[PDB]
């Protein structure tokens, strides 16, 4: 609809965005409260390609300055794609909290999402949110990405402690980046 009303409207298509107040890394980090970490089919069939917040922020700024952003539709995506189970493995390793995955059928998770929607305040997990975690980032190589603008993507491995240092207990609070190895990346 916006493209129809405003033909020369640059449309930015970010993937999952991670950062300090992202509700994506914090989502899995906060999952520790409710027992273990529930992933449907262990989350082994869902590949995600997150992108750091600042790069997309610089992407918008560069798009404004760029005289060629008129009409184009950019897809802002990160450098590497990670299977969701390995991504959660990376998150809980960086937070050093114990990982307790367990399978959960799709219909029952949808029921769980319904229960959490009841809260009249900021919901923690909706049925819609459960679906998003399952939605693997569709690859759109024809769509002009991020490097054409000029911004080089920052791998999530570098700037991951920013989000998750807070979630660490006092025990592993001063632990650095190199303590936890980079997670395996299913690449294109």
Ligand X SMILES: CCCCCCCCCCCCCCCCCC(=O)OC[C@H](COP(=O)([O-])OCC(O)COP(=O)([O-])OC[C@@H](COC(=O)CCCCCCCCCCCCCCCCC)OC(=O)CCCCCCCCCCCCCCCCC)OC(=O)CCCCCCCCCCCCCCCCC
Ligand Y SMILES: CCCCCCCCCCCCCCCCCC(=O)OC[C@H](COP(=O)([O-])OCC[N+](C)(C)C)OC(=O)CCCCCCCCCCCCCCCCC
174 lies in the site for ligand X, by CB under 6 A = no
Considering the complex, state which of residue 1 and residue 122 has its C-beta at the smaller distance from ligand Y: 122
CB 167 within 8 Å of CB 80? no
What is the distance of C-alpha 21 from the center of its chain?
12
From the list 28, 32, 34, the residue with the least C-alpha distance to 46 is 28
Residue in 82, 94, 112, 98 with CA at minimum distance from that of residue 32 = 98
- State which of positions 94-153 bind ligand Y (CB under 6 A): 121-122
How far apart are CB 170 and another protein at their closest, in Å? Answer: 4
Parallel, antiparallel, or unpaired for β 82-83 and 51-52? Answer: unpaired
Q: Is 23 annotated as a binding residue?
A: yes
The end-to-end CA distance of the chain, in Å, is 32
Binding to another protein, residues 126-185 (CB under 8 A)? 166, 168-170, 173
Handedness of CA 105, 136, 27, 37 (dihedral sign): positive
32 touches, from ligand Y, another protein, ligand X, none (C-beta below 5 to 8 Å by class): ligand X
User: Has 16 been labeled as part of a binding site?
Assistant: yes
Instruction: For residue 128, give both structure tokens.
Output: 């819609």
**124 to 163: interface string for ligand X, x by CB under 6 A:** ----------------------------------------
The residues binding ligand X (CB under 6 A) are: 32-33, 169
Binding-site positions for NADPH read 16-17, 22-23
The residues binding another protein (CB under 8 A) are: 166, 168-170, 173
The residues binding ligand Y (CB under 6 A) are: 121-122
């Amino acid at each position: 609809e916006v493209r129809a009303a405003f033909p020369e409207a640059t449309i930015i298509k970010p993937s999952d965005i991670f950062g300090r107040e992202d509700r994506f890394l914090n989502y899995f980090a906060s999952m520790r409260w409710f027992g273990g970490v529930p992933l449907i089919s262990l989350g082994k069939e869902t590949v995600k390609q997150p992108v750091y917040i600042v790069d997309v922020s610089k992407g918008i700024i560069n798009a404004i300055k760029d005289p060629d952003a008129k009409g184009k539709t950019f897809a802002f995506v990160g450098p590497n794609r990670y299977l969701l189970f390995d991504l959660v493995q990376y998150i809980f390793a960086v937070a050093y909290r114990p990982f307790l995955p367990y399978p959960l059928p799709h219909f029952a998770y949808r029921w769980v999402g319904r229960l959490f929607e009841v809260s009249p305040f900021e919901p923690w997990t909706t049925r819609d949110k459960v679906e998003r975690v399952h939605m693997s980032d569709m690859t759109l190589p024809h769509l002009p990405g991020l490097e054409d603008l000029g911004i080089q993507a920052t791998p999530l491995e570098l700037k991951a402690i920013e989000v998750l240092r807070r979630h660490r207990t006092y025990r592993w609070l001063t632990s650095e980046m190199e303590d936890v190895k980079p997670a395996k990346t299913v690449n294109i």
